[PDB]
Amino acid sequence: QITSAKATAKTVRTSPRKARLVIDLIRGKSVADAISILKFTPNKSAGIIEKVLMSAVANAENNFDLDVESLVVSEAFVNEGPTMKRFRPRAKGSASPINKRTSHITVVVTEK
Amino acid sequence: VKGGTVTRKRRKKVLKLAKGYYGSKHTLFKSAKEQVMNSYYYAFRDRRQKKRDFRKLWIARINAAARMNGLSYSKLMHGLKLAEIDINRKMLADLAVNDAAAFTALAEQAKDALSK
Amino acid sequence: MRTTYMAKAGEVERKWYVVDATDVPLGRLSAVVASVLRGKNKPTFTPHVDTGDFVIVINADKVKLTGKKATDKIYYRHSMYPGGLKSVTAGELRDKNSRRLETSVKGMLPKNTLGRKQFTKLNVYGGAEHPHAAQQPEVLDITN
Amino acid sequence: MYAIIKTGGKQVKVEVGQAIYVEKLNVEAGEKVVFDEVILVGGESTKVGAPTVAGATVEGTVEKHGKQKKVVTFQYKPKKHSHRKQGHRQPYTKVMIEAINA
Amino acid sequence: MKLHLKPAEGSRQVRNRVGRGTSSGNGKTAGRGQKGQKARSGGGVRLG
RNA sequence: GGUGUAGUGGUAGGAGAGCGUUCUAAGGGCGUUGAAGGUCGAUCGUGAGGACGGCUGGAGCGCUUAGAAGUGAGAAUGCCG
RNA sequence: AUCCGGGAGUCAGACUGCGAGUGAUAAGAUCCGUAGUCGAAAGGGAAACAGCCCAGACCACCAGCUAAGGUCCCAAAAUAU
RNA sequence: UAGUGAACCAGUACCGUGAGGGAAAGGUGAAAAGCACCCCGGAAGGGGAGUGAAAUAGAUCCUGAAACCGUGUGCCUACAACAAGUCAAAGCUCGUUAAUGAGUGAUGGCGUGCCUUUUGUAGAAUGAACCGGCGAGUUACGAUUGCAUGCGAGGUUAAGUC
């Protein structure tokens, strides 16, 4: 048999450093604690990893498993995606570039 | 003629002589070639200071174990070269550590020679 | 690669010695004591392993200073602040802190991390009595 | 047993049933070698000799002919233009030991 | 003697390519040394 | 071709012999039972460099003799990404 | 060593010992003769040090003898007579 | 990044009132058979199920290096002055193109990067943020010398015709 369903979300418009903070608060914790943690952090990268955990839990339910109450978040990644590029007029004629970055967020949910 | 796969064979043969270097290295092809060169300087030097160092080590151990028998740190040399005994100082170091009986035998013959 | 004893950290047995200081000058006490604490006069060197011994020094109040130097060897300290030399000491330290006169052997050793380990095997007592009698020390004569 | 034996320019300790790493000998694999110069003989009652103790021959047999690893020796001199590149790899002979002095 | 050939001995030299690295003997200023108008591009005075 | 004696630091520079890239010709070869390229390896030669094996990869490429060159990169307050 | 040809670099040199000049018989000054080292020279000594004393590396080894300079402890060798 | 500046709707987009200047951008598979249907989600995006020899070939679609950014772990690190190496080396882990093995490294000796220009550099003279690609003694006509080849008191064609 198998365990550990996956779920990803590609090219999400958040900076990748500011989403590596929230994923440090989940690694190794059960699924019961993690949703409760993510509901009470007022960051933008809270309301995304919520949806990634809920989709991973739903994959594990409605494809393979039972025992929603015995699942543990064992791995979580943030990888960098394709950056947009724009400009901005600085003073005295010149200009300066501006990155606009994207991240790839994955969550793996083993049993225990 | 393009320059396809000629540079990379060089640069990766350089990097594989440069595994285990403190920092950037590993991954910089300009600053990993340099410490390979300086490592070759230190290899040239240090193949020729192995031989200096162990003379000093075995001399210090011969001095200690010779002073254990009352002989000074040098009169073993003069005493053995009058008695026509020509051991390397490596083997005198090993005998002076292990064979206390044989080292006292050699020390007594060196006492016997210069007792004229 | 061949055979010489690179001794290990837990093979060397150490001892405890007693060295008097009644009317011997500083240089020669410190010379013999500093040659002891590196593990010399034993055939089992490494230049790594602490093959030294333990030295206890008795009667530090009665150490000779030959000729002059009684009022003359001005030590010096500076304390990293402006106008901060303190030449407070002299040959006064024979009377007050005769333990401290732990400088003329701390100079004699290397300044590695073995010259900090091997310095902590001196126990210099100004009086004439151990507190360390439970470890059975021995005596060294000095005709050196 | 001890036999401090001059071989080549060097001196080695010798026991029975061991291997030595010796410079070349011009003897083929699996033949007999008799080392002649013996400085000290050990065991219990050591026999110190003014050089080459008389009546002391050390036998022995040769396993292989093989080499050390390479010794890369590159020289350069800074801010000028130089490259000397070499490589060196000496051969050596193992020696099994039989019958320290008969 | 057929298609798969030998020249005469000494019949054909190779070349000498100049400015290709400091161990052939002609890298870094190409057999011209330091500065001066024999070492610029197209320099050198007229004949005589 | 055993064996003697002697020699072997080096900038500008002079001289000699080799390594490697792409193409042409002739001969002999490999390849859907896996070619070129990429990655890893504790391998060989005095040098530049050459093999062998494991993974990836999906249509071409080596070897020998001679020839012809857009034939080798670490620096230009180099140019492009 | 000379002669006949093919091919170059170099025309800013330094300091030290010894003769002189200008200078104030001042300078790591300047300008000449004369020898060495550096330039184009790595190794040992003078604490560290291009030019000073000793000495010129084809390469390997956990062998041996000496130079200049040294031998109470950092640091190898006499607490020498 | 070659070859026309232009392999693609290029003298176009864009820049200057104007004369003028002027780019980047090729590749799924044989066949679109380009993922019906179910689940999470507002959607994007994903996990099954299928098409397919292969989907880690899913449209930014052959292969996919380097700088750069992450995850997990075998070894080490909180009295220590370190051009960051090399030489010596205890312990701990591992098992190769089989051999005088591989990783890591408590601790000790020694040790002022790379170029260019200079009588002299570690220089506080002068250059490089890093990685990748491109990027410099050639050809025609003459002259002279060495080597080789065929003739040799002789040698040899040119323009031009088939």
- Ramachandran angles phi, psi of A103, nearest 5°: -130, 155
Structural domain harbouring A10? 1-112
Does the distance separating the beta carbons of B40 and D74 come in below 8 Å? yes
For residue D91, what is the DSSP state? E
Closest CA to D6 of D56, D46, D43, D45: D56
| Total count of domains within chain A | 1
Helix axes A46-59, A31-39, angle to 10 degrees: 150
C-alpha–C-alpha distance, residues D57 and B12, integer Å? 54
Size of interface B-C (CB pairs under 8 A): 29
E28 is in an annotated binding site: yes
C-alpha–C-alpha distance, residues B87 and D51, integer Å? 9
| Total count of domains within chain B | 1
- For residue B64, the distance in angstroms to the closest alpha carbon of chain D comes to 22
Q: Name the experiment that determined this structure.
A: cryo-EM
**Is the CB of A29 within 7 Å of strand H?**
no
Does the distance separating the beta carbons of B85 and D75 come in below 8 Å? no
C-alpha–C-alpha distance, residues A80 and A16, integer Å? 6
| Total count of domains within chain C | 1
Beta strand spans in D1-102 (E): 3-7, 10-12, 19-22, 38-41, 47-48, 61-67, 91-96
Q: Measuring from the CA of residue D77 to each C1', which nucleotide is nearest? A: G42
Signed CA dihedral, E1, E2, E6, E12: sign only: positive
Chain C environment of B65 (Cβ under 8 Å): 43
Strand F bases, protein C-beta under 7 A:
9-18, 20-22, 25-27, 37-41, 44-50, 64-67, 69-74
Cβ neighbors of A75 (< 8 A, separation 6 or more) are: A27, A106, A107, A108
E29 contacts E39 by C-beta, under 8 angstroms: yes
- For residue E38, the distance in angstroms to the closest alpha carbon of chain D comes to 22
Which chains share 3+ C-beta pairs under 8 angstroms with C?
B
Resolution in A: 3.5
Residue C17 bridge partners (DSSP)? C55, C138
Q: Measuring from the CA of residue E20 to each C1', which nucleotide is nearest? A: F72
For chains D and E, having 3+ Cβ pairs within 8 Å is answered yes
Does the distance separating the beta carbons of B106 and D48 come in below 8 Å? yes
**Is the CB of B31 within 7 Å of strand H?**
yes
Chain D environment of B94 (Cβ under 8 Å): 13
- Ramachandran angles phi, psi of B98, nearest 5°: -90, -65
Structural domain harbouring C143? 1-144
In chain D, the N- to C-terminal Cα span, in Å, equals: 12
To probe the interface with D, which of B35, B41, B111 has the most D CB atoms within 10 Å? B41
Structural domain harbouring B59? 1-116
D81 touches chain E (CB under 8 A): yes
C-alpha–C-alpha distance, residues D95 and D19, integer Å? 5
**DSSP per-residue codes, B59-116:** HHHHHHHHHTTT--TTHHHHHHHHTT----HHHHHHHHHS-HHHHHHHHHHHHHHT--
